[PDB]
C-alpha cells in the first residue's frame, strides 16, 4: 500500500525456497526426503498421463511422436489411444513399401481391432479421431503408461535432453522451397471420395502461413483433384450426404531450421522419419473446409 | 504472491447452511457479463439472463461474449473468483450431467434444465437462484444444436403425427450411459423468437441459394478457368429437374442471414480433458480460449 | 501404506471419521416400609421398656 510495496523488487522463484522446506523448518524437524530441490517445479509444458494396452506401443519406445485418441462405439474400451504410425495402414498417402513394413509390426491382437473400428463406422475418421499431443516418455509394462505432453515443449526431467517429434516420410508435405524462420505444423486429412473407397490420406504439413484463410486458399490449389471427387460423388450418388473434404488442425510450431530427415530402428524395422527437434505442441479442434 | 482474483460479495443475509451449500462449488465455471473487480452478486451467472419471453440460442449468442472464471475460494462475506488465462490448467466440476473422459474437447453451453428437478437443489435466495453453464463435449454440443434446430424447423406442422413421433424422437438421445432428454423449443404450439429468427435465416439463405446460384455459376462459365466450375452448375441443371438494387439487397441479404447464424454453425472449444478425477465429479483440464 | 513399484496402482491418501455413540440403561428396586414401622419409628410413645 505503500511506496516500498510498489517499489518492492519482482519475485523470483529460485531465490526462495519450496514451500515445504520453510514448513519443516519452522517446526525442526528433518525426513530421509531430500526436499531443498523439489523436481518438476520450473516446467512450463503442460502434461499428463494416459494407459494403454501393450499391443500399440510398438514404434513407441523412442521418445517423441504424435497420439491421437480414436473412438470406439463400444462401452468398455470406447477410447482407444493410438499413434500415428498404427494410422499408416489406413492412409491412401502412404506406398506399399512403407506400409508393408510398418504392419509387419503391429501384428498383435489390439492392432487389427484398431484398424477394423476405423473401417467399420458409418462416419469418416475426423469424426472419431481426437487428437492428445505427443508423448515424452514410457513405463513398458504389460499395460505401458505414457506420458503425453498437451502444451508446450517436449523435454526430459531436468531438462537434459530435447524430445523431438518424429514424423513418416509419406505423410510429410512441404509447400515452398524456402522456409522462413518460423513455419507452423498442421494436421491435414483430406478425403478421397471415390468409388471403391472413402479411404483418406494423412499429411502432415510444415508451412510458414498462420492466417488460416491465406492457408486454405492454397489448401484448393493443392487438393483440387479430391474436391473434384467430393463433387463427383455428390452428383453421381444422390441421397447420400458426404461432407468436409479436407480438415486442418493446428498441431503445434517449430524452429523451420532444425528439420532434418532421420530414422527410427525398433525391431530391426528401419523406417524413414522427419525429425523436429525442438516442437512446441500447440493443439487445436479439427478445422474442416472444402 | 497472490493471484489476479475478481471478488464477489452476497447482499443478502447468507445462512451457515446455505454458505456449507455453497463450499462444494469449488471448481464450478460461472459466467462474468463485465470485467469489474468488484462485482454483485446479481451478476454472477445465467439468471442475469434468464428471459421466459426468449429463447435459448439468444442465451447461447450471449454466453459467446462473456468472462467464465472460476470460484477459487468461498468464505464469510465475499467469494473468490479467478480469471482463466489461456495456457495453465485449471480444475472443472463436473456441473453438466454428461459423463467425462480423457481428452474430450470441452464447451460451454447454456443448461437445458432450469427450474423444478429432483438435481436442481442450486444456490438459491429469496429471488436470486444461482444456474450453472452446462459444460458438455464437442460432438455431443453439435448433435444437441442440430437436435434442437431441426426440432424448431417441424414447429409449423406439430399437428400431424408423423412429426409429433419424430419430436419424440429427437428429443431424446442416447450418448456414453446417458439416457438424455431435452427440452422442446416449442410450447403451446407457438415458437419463441429467437428459433423463429434462426429457423428464419436458414430458410432465407438456403432459397437465395436456390435462387441466384443458377444465374452467377451461368454467368461464371464464359469467364470460367477450372473444370470446378463448369461441373457444379451441372448439378444445378440436375437439382432443378430483376432490377440491379434488388439484386444487390438479395445478396446483402442473404450474407445478413449468413451472419446471424455464427452463433450456432459454429463453437469454439474452451477446455480440454488432462486428467479426470475418480467418480468423474471433477476433472483438470488446461485451458484453450 | 506401502510404496507400489512403477505404473501399479499407488496408495491415496486416506482420512476416515468414526463416531462412537453411548446407550442408557436405568435400574431400580424398590422397597416396601410398613405403616407400623414408619408410625413406630419417627413418632414417640409412652415411655414402656
Same mark, same amino acid.
Given at each position: 500500500?505503500?511506496?516500498?510495496?510498489?517499489?518492492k523488487?519482482?519475485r523470483?522463484p529460485?531465490?526462495?525456497?519450496?514451500?515445504?522446506?520453510?514448513?519443516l523448518k519452522? #517446526?525442526?524437524?528433518?525426513?530421509?526426503?531430500s526436499?531443498?530441490?523439489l523436481?518438476h517445479?520450473?516446467?512450463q509444458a503442460?502434461?499428463?498421463r494416459?494407459?494403454?494396452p501393450?499391443?500399440?506401443?510398438?514404434?513407441?519406445?523412442?521418445?517423441g511422436?504424435?497420439?491421437?485418441?480414436?473412438?470406439?462405439g463400444?462401452?468398455s474400451?470406447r477410447h482407444?489411444?493410438?499413434?500415428?504410425?498404427?494410422?499408416?495402414?489406413?492412409a491412401?498417402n502412404?506406398?506399399?513399401?512403407?506400409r508393408?513394413?510398418?504392419?509387419?509390426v503391429y501384428?498383435?491382437?489390439?492392432?487389427?481391432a484398431?484398424?477394423?473400428?476405423?473401417?467399420?463406422g458409418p462416419?469418416?475418421?475426423?469424426?472419431?479421431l481426437?487428437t492428445?499431443?505427443?508423448?515424452k516418455?514410457?513405463s513398458?509394462?504389460?499395460?505401458?503408461?505414457?506420458?503425453?505432453?498437451?502444451?508446450?515443449?517436449?523435454?526430459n526431467t531436468?531438462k537434459?535432453?530435447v524430445?523431438?517429434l518424429m514424423?513418416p #516420410?509419406?505423410?510429410?508435405?512441404?509447400?515452398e522451397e524456402?522456409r522462413?524462420r518460423?513455419?507452423?505444423?498442421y494436421?491435414?486429412?483430406?478425403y478421397?471420395?471415390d468409388?471403391?473407397?472413402?479411404r483418406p490420406?494423412?499429411?502432415?504439413?510444415?508451412?510458414s502461413?498462420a492466417?488460416?484463410?491465406t492457408?486454405?486458399d492454397?489448401?484448393?490449389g493443392?487438393?483440387?483433384?479430391?474436391?473434384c471427387?467430393?463433387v463427383?460423388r455428390?452428383?453421381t450418388?444422390p441421397?447420400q450426404?458426404?461432407?468436409c473434404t479436407?480438415?486442418?488442425? #493446428?498441431?503445434?510450431?517449430?524452429?523451420a531450421?532444425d528439420?532434418?530427415?532421420?530414422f527410427?530402428?525398433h #525391431?530391426?524395422?528401419?523406417l524413414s522419419?522427419?525429425?523436429?527437434?525442438?516442437?512446441?505442441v500447440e493443439?487445436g479442434?479439427?478445422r474442416?473446409?472444402? | 504472491?497472490?493471484?489476479?482474483?475478481?471478488?464477489?460479495?452476497?447482499?443478502?443475509?447468507?445462512?451457515?447452511?446455505?454458505?456449507?451449500?455453497?463450499?462444494?462449488?469449488?471448481?464450478a465455471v460461472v459466467?462474468?457479463?463485465? /470485467?469489474?473487480h468488484?462485482?454483485?452478486?446479481?451478476?454472477?451467472?445465467?439468471?442475469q439472463f434468464?428471459?421466459?419471453?426468449?429463447g435459448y440460442?439468444? +442465451? /447461447?449468442g450471449?454466453?459467446?461474449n462473456?468472462?467464465?472464471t472460476?470460484?477459487?475460494r468461498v468464505?464469510?462475506?465475499?467469494?473468490?473468483?479467478?480469471?482463466?488465462?489461456?495456457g495453465l +490448467?485449471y480444475?472443472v466440476?463436473?456441473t453438466?450431467p454428461?459423463?467425462?473422459?480423457?481428452?474430450?474437447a470441452l464447451?460451454?453451453?447454456?443448461?437445458l434444465?432450469?427450474?423444478?428437478?429432483?438435481?436442481?437443489?442450486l444456490?438459491?435466495?429469496?429471488?436470486?437462484?444461482?444456474?450453472?453453464?452446462?459444460?458438455v463435449?464437442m460432438?455431443?454440443? +453439435?448433435?444437441?444444436n442440430?437436435?434442437l434446430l431441426?426440432?424448431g424447423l417441424?414447429? +409449423?406442422? /406439430?399437428?400431424?403425427?408423423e412429426?409429433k413421433?419424430?419430436?419424440?424422437?429427437?428429443?431424446?438421445?442416447?450418448?456414453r450411459?446417458?439416457?438424455?432428454?431435452?427440452?422442446?423449443?416449442?410450447i403451446?404450439?407457438?415458437?419463441?423468437?429467437?428459433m423463429?429468427?434462426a429457423?428464419?435465416?436458414?430458410?432465407?439463405?438456403?432459397?437465395?441459394?436456390?435462387?441466384?446460384?443458377?444465374?452467377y455459376?451461368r454467368?461464371?462459365?464464359?469467364?470460367?478457368?477450372?473444370?470446378?466450375?463448369?461441373?457444379?452448375?451441372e448439378?444445378?441443371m /440436375?437439382?432443378?429437374?430483376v432490377?440491379p438494387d434488388?439484386?444487390?439487397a438479395r445478396?446483402?441479404?442473404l450474407?445478413?442471414?449468413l451472419?446471424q447464424?455464427?452463433?450456432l454453425?459454429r463453437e469454439?472449444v474452451?477446455?480440454?480433458?488432462c486428467?479426470?478425477?475418480?467418480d468423474n465429479?471433477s476433472?483438470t483440464?488446461?485451458?484453450?480460449? | 501404506r506401502?510404496?507400489?513399484?512403477?505404473?501399479?496402482?499407488?496408495?491415496?491418501q486416506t482420512?476416515?471419521?468414526?463416531?462412537?455413540?453411548s446407550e442408557?440403561?436405568?435400574?431400580?428396586?424398590?422397597f416396601?416400609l410398613?405403616?407400623?414401622?414408619?408410625?413406630?419409628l419417627?413418632?414417640?410413645?409412652?415411655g414402656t421398656?
Open positions: 500500500m505503500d511506496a516500498r510495496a510498489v517499489a523488487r519482482p523470483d529460485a531465490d526462495e525456497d519450496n514451500e515445504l522446506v520453510t514448513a519452522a #517446526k525442526r524437524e528433518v525426513n530421509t526426503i526436499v531443498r530441490y523436481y517445479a520450473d516446467h503442460l502434461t499428463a494416459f494407459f494403454v501393450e499391443g500399440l506401443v510398438e514404434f513407441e519406445a523412442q521418445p511422436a504424435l497420439l491421437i485418441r480414436m473412438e470406439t463400444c462401452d474400451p482407444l489411444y493410438i499413434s500415428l504410425y498404427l494410422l499408416g495402414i489406413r491412401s502412404v506406398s506399399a513399401s512403407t508393408c513394413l510398418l504392419e509387419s501384428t498383435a491382437s489390439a492392432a487389427r484398431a484398424l477394423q473400428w476405423l473401417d467399420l462416419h469418416l475418421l475426423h469424426r472419431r481426437e492428445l499431443g505427443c508423448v516418455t514410457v513398458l509394462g504389460i499395460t505401458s503408461l505414457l506420458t503425453c505432453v498437451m502444451r508446450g515443449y517436449l523435454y531436468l537434459t535432453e524430445f523431438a514424423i #516420410k509419406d505423410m510429410y508435405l512441404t509447400w524456402t522462413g518460423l513455419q507452423y505444423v494436421l491435414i486429412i483430406v478421397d471420395y468409388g471403391p473407397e472413402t490420406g494423412i499429411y502432415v504439413l510444415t508451412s502461413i492466417h488460416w484463410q492457408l486454405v492454397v489448401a484448393r493443392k487438393f483440387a483433384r479430391e474436391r471427387s467430393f463427383n455428390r452428383i450418388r441421397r450426404i458426404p461432407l479436407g480438415v486442418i488442425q #493446428k498441431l503445434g510450431w517449430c524452429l531450421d528439420i532434418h530427415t532421420s527410427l530402428v #525391431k530391426e524395422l528401419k522419419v522427419v525429425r523436429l527437434d525442438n516442437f512446441s493443439l479442434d479439427f474442416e473446409f472444402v | 504472491a497472490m493471484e489476479a482474483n475478481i471478488f464477489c460479495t452476497f447482499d443478502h443475509k447468507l445462512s451457515i447452511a446455505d454458505v456449507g451449500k455453497l463450499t462444494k462449488l469449488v471448481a459466467p462474468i457479463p463485465q /470485467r469489474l468488484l462485482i454483485k452478486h446479481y451478476q454472477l451467472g445465467l439468471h434468464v428471459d421466459h419471453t426468449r440460442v439468444r +442465451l /447461447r450471449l454466453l459467446r462473456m468472462t467464465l472460476l470460484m477459487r468464505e464469510g462475506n465475499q467469494i473468490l473468483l479467478h480469471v482463466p488465462t489461456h +490448467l480444475t466440476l463436473n453438466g454428461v459423463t467425462w473422459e480423457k481428452g474430450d464447451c460451454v453451453l447454456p443448461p434444465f432450469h427450474g423444478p428437478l429432483a438435481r436442481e437443489n444456490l438459491t435466495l429469496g429471488q436470486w437462484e444461482l444456474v450453472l453453464p452446462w459444460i463435449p460432438p455431443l454440443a +453439435l448433435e444437441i442440430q437436435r431441426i426440432m417441424f414447429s +409449423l406442422d /406439430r399437428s400431424y403425427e412429426v413421433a419424430a419430436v419424440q424422437q429427437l428429443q431424446t438421445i442416447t450418448f450411459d446417458a439416457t438424455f432428454t431435452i427440452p422442446d423449443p416449442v403451446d404450439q407457438h415458437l419463441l423468437i429467437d423463429k429468427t429457423c428464419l435465416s436458414m430458410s432465407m439463405v438456403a432459397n437465395l441459394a436456390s435462387e441466384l446460384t443458377m444465374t455459376v454467368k461464371l462459365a464464359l469467364e470460367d478457368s477450372s473444370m470446378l466450375l463448369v461441373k457444379c452448375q448439378l444445378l /440436375r437439382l432443378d429437374r432490377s434488388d439484386e444487390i445478396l446483402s441479404a450474407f445478413v442471414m451472419r447464424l455464427d452463433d454453425i469454439q474452451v477446455f480440454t480433458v486428467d479426470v478425477s475418480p465429479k476433472a483440464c488446461i485451458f484453450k480460449g | 506401502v510404496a507400489s513399484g512403477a505404473g501399479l496402482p499407488t496408495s491415496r482420512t476416515i471419521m468414526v463416531t462412537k455413540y442408557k440403561s436405568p435400574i431400580t428396586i424398590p416396601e410398613s405403616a407400623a414401622c414408619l408410625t413406630y419417627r413418632e414417640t410413645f409412652e421398656i
